């Protein structure tokens, strides 16, 4: 807000305030200009859910169980820039820069730890109408990069762009015509790009201050450690905030 901007740095630190997106006040309309460029879009999710096999009364249909985040306060995106292009039918947004990834890890019932990169990279938003309204609702696809960049070294010392490529303390595996092709999947490290679909919804606007904010819902796919396991579908919900300029 501007109320957050009143504070100094020593009053914010250690209080968990910089993690939290602003609260926009009031509702009206604002029109995106021709050269309109979005300035301070922050996204913070308030709840997480992982698609699992749930234990109902007699059936095992797939449902979302929620989860507790374990990385502490590092989940919020910030400073996301981008120009707001005006197509004729629908106003669009394409993000350009800003902190658009925040790696985090949630824990399921059972003790399973599921990390996932929460990101909005290469987002193509499209929403009904032209002007931002309390009934406005935009969304679109984003590309999730892999959770580890290819020069990550696993405990044996094997990466996609560096490291070894065989079980380094098992030297008798590469004997014979077959070699170590039985454990081939854990040697080949494949950088993976998946898709994610976010759906935002503006409901409170200032036009005298040119800042909007509302509730979103985002679904994406968790990580796999370069093909080590099957990734799992992760749903999340929260609130965002943006400065329309």
């Amino acid at each position: 807000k501007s109320q957050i901007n009143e504070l100094s740095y020593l009053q914010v630190k250690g209080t968990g305030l910089a993690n939290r997106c602003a609260e926009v006040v009031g509702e009206d309309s604002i029109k995106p200009k021709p050269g309109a460029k979005l300035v301070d879009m922050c996204i913070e999710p308030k709840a997480w859910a992982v698609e699992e096999e749930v234990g109902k009364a007699g059936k095992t249909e797939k449902k979302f169980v929620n989860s507790k985040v374990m990385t502490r306060q590092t989940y919020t995106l910030d400073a996301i820039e981008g120009p707001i292009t005006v197509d004729g039918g629908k106003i669009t947004f394409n993000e350009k820069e800003g902190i658009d990834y925040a790696a985090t890890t949630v824990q399921l019932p059972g003790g399973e730890r599921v990390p996932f990169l929460f990101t909005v990279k290469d987002l193509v938003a499209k929403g009904n109408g032209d002007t931002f309204k309390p009934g406005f609702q935009m969304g679109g696809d984003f590309n999730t990069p892999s959770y580890r960049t290819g020069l990550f070294l696993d405990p044996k010392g094997r990466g996609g762009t560096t490291g070894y490529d065989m079980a380094v303390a098992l030297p008798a595996l590469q004997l014979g015509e077959e070699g170590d092709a039985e454990l081939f999947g854990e040697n080949n490290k494949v950088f993976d790009i998946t898709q994610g679909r976010i759906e935002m919804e503006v409901n409170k606007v200032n036009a005298e201050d040119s800042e909007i904010g509302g509730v979103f819902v985002a679904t994406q796919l968790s990580d796999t450690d370069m093909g080590s396991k099957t990734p799992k579908k992760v749903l999340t919900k929260g609130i965002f905030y943006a400065k329309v300029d």
Binding site: K68, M70, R72, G111, L153, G157
Partner: protein
Amino acid sequence: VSLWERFCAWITSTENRLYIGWFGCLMFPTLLTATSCFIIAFIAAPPVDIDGIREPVAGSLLYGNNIISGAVVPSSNAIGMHFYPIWEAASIDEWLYNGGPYQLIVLHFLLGVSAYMGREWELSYRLGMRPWIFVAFSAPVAAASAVFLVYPIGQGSFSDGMPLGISGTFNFMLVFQAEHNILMHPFHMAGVAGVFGGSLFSAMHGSLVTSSLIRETTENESTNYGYKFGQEEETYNIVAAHGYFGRLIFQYASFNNSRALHFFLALWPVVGIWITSMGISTMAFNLNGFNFNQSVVDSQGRVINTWADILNRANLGIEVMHERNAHNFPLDLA
């Protein structure tokens, strides 16, 4: 008569089985909580992000370890030096992920060991003893506070603190070699001389007493039964063991005084471990050991290798491999 005087009379009574004392008022609650959390965290504790890079390192027995590899993992690099109790963690699952129980065990350990040390003073006061057994115990208290407290302070994180385990100890010693060169530092040199000397004068004093024992048994029963407990006769000819060592090296190198002899056994190790534990302390603040790399040159100016250059190439191997993902910039400032 009062309730407090009848409680001070019990808590300072030497007639208890174990003397409790006023230091036991904060020795026993501290060390039983360091114990009861250690047994649970060593047996059943989920993996811990130590490098702060969200790569959790398993350290307990239920997650596929043994006595050697299993270890209570230090806290995260993300926390660092911050105090991280259970109530400042928003769940226990968030506490156990980020290296929770390393701070609960260590801080209740260093309070309980510094209270076990003062408890050794207290009973020496109530028994009429001269007081200074607790000064000899200052030497492992100096060394325990050096690797769990002082070295995480000067390096700015408990993640550089020592892992509570057996294989975690040798992860600690080797990474400390590459980054600080402890073997060339003269305070590890002054305590290797403290424990090689300490184990020498232990087995040198323990042999000269056992050599000069007086006949009090038969050849059928044990040698040890010639000492009745609480007797007032001396159980070995001390003139005999003085004349032996007075000929084994020469005459003037032998302590005829048994009090000055039994003082030198307490001096040499304890001074050797005071000095050593202030080697880790001065190397906690990056005042490393000696560095004689590229010190010998010819007249042309080409570097002639020494043994320190071969030792350097062993340090360069551990330096480029410790925390192989945690670094992003060319110099390990931490």
